Amino acid sequence: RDKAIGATVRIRRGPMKGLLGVIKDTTDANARVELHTGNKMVTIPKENLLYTTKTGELISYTEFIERSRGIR
Amino acid sequence: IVSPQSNKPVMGIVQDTLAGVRKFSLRDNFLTRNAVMNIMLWVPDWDGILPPPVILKPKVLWTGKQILSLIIPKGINLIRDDDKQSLSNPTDSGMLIENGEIIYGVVDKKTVGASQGGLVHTIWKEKGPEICKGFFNGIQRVVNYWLLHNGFSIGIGDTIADADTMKEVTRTVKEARRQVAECIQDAQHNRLKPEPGMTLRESFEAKVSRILNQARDNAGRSAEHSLKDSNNVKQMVAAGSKGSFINISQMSACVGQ
Amino acid sequence: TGAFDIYLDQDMLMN
Amino acid sequence: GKAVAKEDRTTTPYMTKYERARILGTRALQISMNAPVLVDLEGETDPLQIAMKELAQKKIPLLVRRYLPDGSYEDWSVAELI
Amino acid sequence: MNQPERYELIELMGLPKVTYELDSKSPNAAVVTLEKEDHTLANMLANQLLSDERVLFAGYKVPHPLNHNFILRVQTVEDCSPKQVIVDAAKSLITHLEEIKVNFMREWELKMISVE
Amino acid sequence: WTHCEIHPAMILGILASIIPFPDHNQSPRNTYQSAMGKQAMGVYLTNYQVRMDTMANILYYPQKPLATTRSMEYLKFRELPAGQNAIVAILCYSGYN
Amino acid sequence: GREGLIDTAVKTAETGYIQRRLVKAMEDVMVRYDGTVRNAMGDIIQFAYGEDGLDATLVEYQVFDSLRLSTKQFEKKYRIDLMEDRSLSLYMENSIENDSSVQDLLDEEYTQLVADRELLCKFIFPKGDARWPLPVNVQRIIQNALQIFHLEAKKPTDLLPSDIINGLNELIAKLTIFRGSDRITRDVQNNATLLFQILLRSKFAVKRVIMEYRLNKVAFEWIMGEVEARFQQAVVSPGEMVGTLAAQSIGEPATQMTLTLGVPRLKEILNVAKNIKTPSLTIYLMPWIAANMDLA
Amino acid sequence: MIIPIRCFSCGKVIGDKWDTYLTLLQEDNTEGEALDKLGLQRYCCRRMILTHVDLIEKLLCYNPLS
């Protein structure tokens, strides 16, 4: 059960940088993401996505894993 | 491409490609170096050699028939005489293809349609389905490029016949009305001999139907004859791509009975 | 296409 | 059903279009299931193309058992068919 | 749903901008494929090439409107190469556009001064 | 004459009255337009915002036709039109039409 | 226009039912490997598909030249009299003037040609129709030979009459549809290829092959081989579903028929209606009566 | 609905002329004269002012409040 699925994300790098969306599905490498505009649906590498937290911050992918591990 | 139902092709050149191949193969269609040399890139399996121009001076030019013949495979022979006099038609009718080269004749449904004994049937039978497919592709691509850069259109001005032609149509219809009037008068005085095995009412109805049909056809003939060869409706009719004489007559002269 | 049956020719499979 | 002698065969000596389609399909299906290929491969990956090139060299090891309406049949090699 | 992204008209996605190959069927003939380019460049390039005497053949095509690119086939005389004539035509066009630019700017300044 | 017609154009229905110059067409074309005008997208009611219909299709920027029939005033097609005035060229351009 | 729309909406269903009925009646009729057309019960429907055993796809219209020629013109175009005629050697590299055996071959040729013309004019096409779909476009193959070999009309040919006769006879012997050493197999083969043989003999008469086409040995051999190959390509393949193909070929044009004539008449024919809308007779009178109005 | 920002064909900005167009009409100007005064020369750009229907105003009448 991936922790990324259902998480709001924006596209970091690439031609579609700056678009908001929600990760509907996730493979090991890429995440299948539901963009909010134009009923669009894309596949974007997990490393290419800024993730939105509860406080409105945008975090990197590695930051997301480090947050999900819960070690502290 | 060729079906067993009528032992003839079921596929052919249609609509824009047909109209544009009628316009492309006209005698006075001259292509300049630029146009021929852009078209060559659309010829499938082009061997890389420019066909020699048919006019060398004062201006270097190719013809539509010459360029179109590059799409017909070598070893295709086709004769189609519309008149049985000479191979020197002043009107460029008929069709002569020798070893894949068009000698004379405008290319139409009579040549590239799904007609029996035409270019498609000949190419299929002689060369094979694959080479016939190649012919389809090549002719479509070449004529589509040329027509894209030539343009073909139609408007409300092509349904209009000049004033004299409308006088002709009006006089035809007036004479038909007159004839029907004396027919009614005669039928009202038992002066109309019933046709064998036909009651008087039926015979009168048939007579008036013939008169009115003939009036419509005469008006349509006048309208079509008045129309020019630059007329878009007549261009489409001559190509065989869409329409016919009935449509021209109904749009221009008289809808009829 | 099914108006006949296909068999192996073992004489050819030897060679 | 009685097999007809090779000399007594009366059917056409040519491969019918239906026979050609069936033979190519059957050989391609067998190749796709790892049947040894009886022709040199130049890097072809489609079993149907491999079967086609086997046919061109008459290297398909198959027979056609053509049945006559009464039940007697003739076996024709794909190699000997024209 | 099956729409292509319009940025695909401007992004190479790893494709090379220019591809140059030698046409084997014909001597001294080359095919140049330009990706994410259209009639704007191709038309003027082919016309400039045909202003040149060393150019026997110069044509271009867009194989499909749904792919943004165009092919340009050029054949030259035996003493020259297609690549050299293409480069010379491109340089000549650059210079020509430069005079167009300079003269436009000069005329615009004169006209505006006239307005005042 | 015992009577006289107020206007012949009144022999037409709702949708046949939206066709411009229906008397210059072949009649099955008039029938086809009468059938297809029902499926045209426009604004069906002004209160479609507050209506929770099962299905609704709304045109962004509906325009009233440039060529209109006098019967349109009573059908209120200008008020709630279902189309747009497009610049149309009748041309063979690339063979994709 | 309303009538037109109604006619469309009714004719569609009428023809759909007609086509389903047609296909169901002939779905099982197939060409067998012995050349016969039989249904699923083995009952013979035809002894040779189309009575000639050819695929309808591969046939093309050919004109029978000898049919409409007069006896004088037929003689002129086909009769060779070396005793009276010397122009033949003008067209040939080898002199055959006053040759006995060659004249005997020409006489046998002309007797066969006259028999073929009699059979055409009296038994096959008494109405005088000449254009009929046959296998192989022989005229097109002849044109291909003229073009391919650059045949100069002014160059005498090396073809002897015996070469032409032997080549045409061997070709005709190689147009095998039915195979077997029996007697009725020979009869059916001859019947199946009879019309094609007549056309071939009218096309490749020695007088035509020499004085008209100016063929040479290489061109003639190429024509013979090409005709043989094309004919062997026209033979209907065993296992073809000729019944369903015929059903579809008849039904498809019915969808464009005029809804007695048209779909109603087709429905009357197909159901074998004992009572039809327009019973009629076509009584033909005697030749002397039919040529006068009063006796009629 | 509301007047489009740009023309569909010419791409000219017409979304800043609807009020001016209506005001011109109020001043006893024909629609043709008003379009002329707005500098709309291309008939493609003219058709969109001519044939625009303002459904926004009717949609604003269903205000949940008064």
Add this chain to the structure above:
Amino acid sequence: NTPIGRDGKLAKPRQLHNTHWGMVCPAETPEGQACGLVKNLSLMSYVSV
């Protein structure tokens, strides 16, 4: 709606009658099985109560 059989092929009820002038729309009628059976009142046609 005319409750005639929509499968039975009776062209006469489907046809446009002379008396339909001014009462029913000559053009507006569906294409298909209900052609001519489903009709639409003209603009000024009044049905008595």
Add this chain to the structure above:
Amino acid sequence: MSESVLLDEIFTVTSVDKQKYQRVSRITAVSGQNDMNLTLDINSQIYPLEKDATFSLQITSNLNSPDLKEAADYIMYGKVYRVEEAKDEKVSVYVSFGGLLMAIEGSHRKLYRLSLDHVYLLLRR
């Protein structure tokens, strides 16, 4: 040294027909000694030929010579696709320049060199 000149004559134009096409016209012409008849389709737009105009017509098998090509005012490249010999010694030759038809009818003596092959037509006014 002009073995390639299959024909060389002078022709006077008697009629011109420009009713069917806008860019092509059919000219009828007669030789100086009324022993040939020519009907030629020409691109009248780039090379008009009025009625009663004299012009030298040449038919060659190639353009190797520079002087023949340079002097010619109009050059076409066609194929001789039809030849017939009349029963009265006359020969008629029909040529097709990519669709533009030429019919030259004359004496066998001087039309004997026109065979069914590609040829060049050179007009010079």
Add this chain to the structure above:
Amino acid sequence: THITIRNISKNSVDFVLTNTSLAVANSLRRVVLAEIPTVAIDLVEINVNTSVMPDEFLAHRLGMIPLDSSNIDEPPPVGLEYTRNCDCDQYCPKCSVELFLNAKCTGEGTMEIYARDLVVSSNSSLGHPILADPKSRGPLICKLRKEQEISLRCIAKKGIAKEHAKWSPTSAVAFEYDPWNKLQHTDYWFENDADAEWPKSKNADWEEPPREGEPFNFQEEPRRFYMDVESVGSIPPNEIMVQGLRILQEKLAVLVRDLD
């Protein structure tokens, strides 16, 4: 070469291009209509929208609004970069402009929201809506009634009309040549008289009419083109022309660099 400017307006330039091939004139027209960069609202983040206008309706309307794009090709902070090329996480002053629309109708009447109601983040004169009408409002965005609110943030990026017609700085390019058809590049359609049935253009007075008796000139080519470039407002017409000529040059230069 040469250029003659016949007229200059606030929104268009009408000139004559001479001593040029038709291919170059057409490429100038195409590049001016297709490939000149411009700044336009691209991404809309909507917090409150209680108007009758759907959200994407509003977004599309906002994207259509022309923003000042002059000097958008100069290096930042004078111009902009494509956000795809820029190194910012999502956007920044180098590759974007921020606009804000916060409107609320508390009165009784109807509140008309125009382009002047957009608030632009101050980093340059780039991205500022063009207010060209006499009242300096710009395009009418929306209309509201009492208690209806809009609150949204727009991110305007760089682009060209190939990706979306909103990035186009020109409305239409008038383009004519050979007003007398001396070259017969078109076969005029007519019923009785083509000359009488086809109106003469205004550019016909800038060329000498055909001389009676002159032979058809079959070697001549079109070398005089009457062009008119009309701007949307974002870029002045002269800058549009200069930028088109720069873009064509740069395409050719990329070709040369890649081949060499």
Add this chain to the structure above:
Amino acid sequence: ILQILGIEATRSALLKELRNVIEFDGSYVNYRHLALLCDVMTSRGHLMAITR
């Protein structure tokens, strides 16, 4: 025709009337299909109606 002239004459009449129906419009169907229909309808000695 079947009761008067027999079954072969019936097959010929079937063929003629089928061709009259089909070719009235100007269309053409190959003789093989009409002949096969007639032979199926006459194979068993009487007219087999194409119906249930």
Add this chain to the structure above:
Amino acid sequence: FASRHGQKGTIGMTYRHEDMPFSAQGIVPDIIINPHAIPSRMTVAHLVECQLSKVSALSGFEGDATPFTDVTVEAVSKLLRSHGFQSRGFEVMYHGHTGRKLVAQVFLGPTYYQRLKHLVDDKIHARARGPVQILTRQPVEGRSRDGGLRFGEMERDCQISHGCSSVLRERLFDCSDAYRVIVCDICGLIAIAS
């Protein structure tokens, strides 16, 4: 999309502003329709509408297209010519790709078009595998429910006339409701198989 004259079509291709034919004013059409649609259908009302709409867009007066009026095409032509246009509605257009002036003059003008409720995305459907009916165990019906397409009687007939026995076997057995049973060789009835 459709006109008000029975002229229905689908979009086959879209071209951008630069690639479409233009007039000397720079007018680019929104829609390009084929000439061949006009002659056979004889929808002259479409052409009269286009000419009248052009006149009304130029003059601003609304166009009366009411039937049975004295509005003739000649009067509309005179009105159109009064605006400096070719009276019959033709315009010299230039090629977008090359800027060259088309040999033919185009019939160009405004026409009222309608977007129809038939959108391609509402219709596009593809099935590989999915739900089957409970009773017959065949692909269910309907796009909305992930159903298969019907291989009917006429399609079976077409594949029979083709002679493709394996195509029929695949379509009707391997791709729809393949099933296996065990039969008793003595009584020929389905057996109890574990």
Add this chain to the structure above:
RNA sequence: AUCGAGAGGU
């Protein structure tokens, strides 16, 4: 899910 009715598409 099933059944029935209706509106439509080619």
